[PDB]
């Protein structure tokens, strides 16, 4: 599986990637000098949780092409962008490691967070590795990194065995956390990378990410090992935590750089917990926002109280039957025919349990909107535009330039054949429909 | 004449209606199982008085379409809503009878009173007909209403002759209050209705309106016959009066259910009296509305209190001389020239005595608006729409699409004796002029 | 509700009709000289059974326009055609009465039975009323009918009272089966018809339908009253039964012509029973035909036996859960991935109980068909054509000119968004898909 | 350049006008009997200060058409309106001279000051020239003006030489303040005017503007010459100042009527000072508005406070060196590269001192935008639209319909000197660029 992301002379820059599972897209960005297959312990856990794991090999590493140009985070983010755009991910999760944490930071700070739901930084490079007079929180001067570069061009293969000695802490974890077989393969992966890439990659480690940090507006997770030899914890995560206090901070005791394998159990537990927590918060933040707009059409009374509980009992996840709901919604005294349709429309999008009902008829008759030929035509012009939309705020703004009858008819288009459009965009119409009747 | 209010399969649910006369819109809603033509005696009196009679046929009755769905007051009110919206009525009058009294209450409790000036409940269903343990004030248990439904489904046509026997009290009024021919027509009307409508209509009689009663904020009239056999007065109007004491209560002695025809002379007298009283209340309520917008331009001080008194002493009908008003209005130090014109313009329209003398100039120079042909042209374009306009909300709505300079010149047109628009639209200009200074 | 079906000089020929309920379309064609409202006892029973009742007024009768041309069964069938085409009915039921039985016969013999599922003849005219030397089974010579025509032009209104005297047998059923009120309305309906229509309609009674009878290839029901005075049972249904022995024959004892009201209970019971029986037979005749083709792809073994029972337990109507079925279908040893998708596709179309499952994934991956760009394109060309198709035989023939992979991909289009197309057309693809793999 | 403002028979009434410079729109209205070109000394001074000079010729004078109807101030103001509306001026300045002062006064009392920021009356006609019994403060009786009309109709050309003798005071200023050549051109202009215009114009001089004076709510400037022979200062400006005390009053000593040329130095100083005061209130509120959008890209912190100070110290006009600014902007840790370019782009547009030196590089690399052929192509499509635009609000709205990458690249085109739009439009790009990054 490849994705063309560039062009070099006569050759085309293609990246190897894998696409597994179904659900919330989770992008795993590996680090130096491994490939996407180094996530194999994290991949298994994410697939069991019900996520969609998408891993790719960075240019010059793994099974991807090996160019001699474009080795900077501005290009790396551009490659990530191309991957996200081609695969068309919405509300995805970016998880980075080593060099991968830089790609996550650079993408959010350059391409925004229209497609991103949450981020995770495992053994990050942030905020700065280069120790200068402007930033004493560095780990080493440029003379150190230059020694590494000269070492790779000297003997790239021999450099690996020494690098992995501090990567997994073989003087501490060999035969314990990581077998001798696992070390050999990690060497093979590094050896199967680009010769020019491994010599150019370290020159990207001392890149300044200080300008990229405050552009993070999504729930973040900063995780780092205490026994990390390659990336000193005191020069990375500690000052990063100060720059982004809102991010969940987790230190793994006695964990090397490659804590993806050694301390897999600790990382996998903390990562799945963060995702289960952070995505639950936004899923619910759209539900209470919809509930706000939906209750703004219901006249104050006992029903406005009753409708809220039937919603809350659904928003929490308590089992409820639609037949009783759809019937109880029909036999409602205060509610107008128009608002019965809107409530029924919400109830279908909020319950995983459809109860095996094809569809209801009282709402279809309610969502007609007086059946005006010019009004139904204004509903299909909207329906084509909502399919191209991705965000909640995007769906609401577009569907606010149409009449209330048009929105209802447009809701009818979505009610019979959904969908196409997605639930986040679906709520954008509903929140717009209830807002127009005010 | 039809108004589309719904949709059924391939067919459209249309309602037959009539629009006669010019003046204050009066909407007459018939009851079971007649049509809009049953108001022909009340209509005639309203047409002679100078009102605007608007009658429509309920779905499944009269000349309207005959659907098999939506026979509840929420649909009945929704249909009523669509009718009011299409004709775009402001400060209209709702008169209900039998089932029609239910539609008025449900409309007010669901769609508000933005278009309603006053309401009237003739032989009401309110508050409840179904006699249960929670409400002993019912007229009969559900087994009774179900017997009627079963009687209709047996032979709806044979059911009519028996129904009309207690409807008009033929053992008391036949040959006296109502001829046999008029009864024949009432049968034909019932026979020309929907078969499903007549079988679904009785199930709406025992609807609870107790939650809708206190939502009535417009002047109401509760009228009922003492000899009503179909709707016992002790189970309807008597307990209805306790829930809404503010409503004018009038009993017609020895009057049956169909008192629209039998005691027509009595009903028309009580109804015309109610409108002349309730609208007089609103005429002055528009004057206080003008006072509201006009005082929002006057600076806080002793004058803002005195001006309110100068307005109220005129609005009530107390005798006042223009010479004192026009002179005292002229020699005011703090008030700007613009607000002098608006105050003078109001003062000229509310007092009948101009004395047949010259015109004034200080108001004329402010309301001239500099006398520019294109500015006067935006005033005559306004003048062209205001002579064709009838309502207060209509004049206001139109002159808000014009420049601030245009409003001044248009107020000048009516003051300078060029134009001659109605009193209600003139205030629409004033309220719009005062609205622009905000 | 009107349907334009013709043109006369400056005027347009429109027909009044009603469209109620949802389900299998049942067209009720009234007789002379009533309207569609005369089905009001049959309409109520059909609406409770779950059918879709569609009644219309014949040209020159009821609320329909009253032309002076086109009074023949060739035109009457043409009008029926226009109604069926405009409403777009599929697998509908034609029920005729008096003159209406002729319209049913003429339509089937001229326009085919592409839209017809079953027919019913209540008090038929078939096969011939005119008693000549060629057909002694007539009821009267032409001199009799000519006396009627002269009687109508003499006094159309007076003719009705005498006609209804033999129509309902008032000397037998008045005050018993039919009230005096019901008779008055039937008069009103006849009086509200076309003056020229009532004088031209009888000249259509002695029309020869002998050439139309053998074109009936659908399940039929011949019903007639024994006490029918207008249409002698011995001259109609008796010789009709001989011409069509396959038709269910039912005689109602002591029933007049208008047995629609008098013997409503007997007719409604026999009609609902025939429909419940006759449509069950075809619904099942498509299921066993599909089962035949579906089992023709499964290799002989224990599963071919097991798959048949899971289908039969569904075809009968026994409750079954899809989750167990879809999972058991997945974990099948002999079955290829391709055939798993087809079985899952059948299981979704056969159960009313969807169990509240959004959709399955193993079948979507199965129905891909190797994901060939040229093969998926050949699937959408088919999908546009299947929406325009109506019959089972029509769907099969079209979808037999495409590759097996195209059908699978086309089944995928229908699997994600059905539908669009309908189940009868849906099975046409399946039966074609399994047939191509042979 | 012409503006259609009316219609006369087969011909169209067009006015010649000029639109020069960029900044606050200043409309200069000339007087009798010259043209718009008589402002050439004020135009030059206003253009150097950085204003936008807009002059037009009154109907019947200069290069404008010469109709024989519509010679009154109500029409003159109407013409001015059409010009202001067509050009769509916002917060403009109306400056009148001689006969021109009446149009400014006449415009403000009819169309408001929604488009007007300030007004200026040079050698005004206000408040009244006609000496009557109501106003002894007049300049002349009706017999004087009638003598002028008769003098013009006698020999319009000969009238000019005598008129200009008192217009510029040739017996005092000839050869000193104004040459004989300048007078000759002034003669040519008057002779090229309408014959009927010069005979109808004087009849507008004695028009009453007293009702128009108190409607002036904007900062005003009353200026007049003391040695004015055509308009005696004691009968015009002296009593005008009393009617509008809030207006800045400035008398030019020893100045004739035509003080636009003779005392240009005196007028330009007083006019620019008046403009510098009334317009300054608006000048600062747009600069802070730019600052508002610019600060919306800077992350909240200590720098957001320092950057605000760096903006304010430049907007006021305090001397600052770009080398320190561009270097300090370059060596900023928190600021992203993209926002560095925008700040540098603003810093380059706000300081007049380029030092006649080189360009900067850190901004060139930021405004590149990844150098994508399609993103850069969307930048040149914008540049074509921005060269034709004039206002700040106009530039912002257009460049808000393009992508963020295009805006960056478009800012690059103008910065790398591949284009040249105005400062007001330049900020329109910046303000549009900053709004999209949110």
Swiss-Prot record, chains A, B, C, D:
It holds the Pfam family Abhydrolase_1. The keyword Oxidoreductase applies. SUPFAM superfamilies: alpha/beta-Hydrolases (SSF53474). One of its GO terms (biological process) is antibiotic biosynthetic process. It comes from the Bacteria. The active site is at residues 98, 228, 257. The keyword Oxidoreductase applies. Keywords: Antibiotic biosynthesis, Oxidoreductase, Peroxidase, Plasmid. Belongs to the AB hydrolase superfamily. Bacterial non-heme haloperoxidase / perhydrolase family. Homotrimer. May be a chlorinating enzyme involved in 7-chlorotetracycline biosynthesis. This is Non-haem bromoperoxidase BPO-A2. It comes from Kitasatospora aureofaciens (Streptomyces aureofaciens).
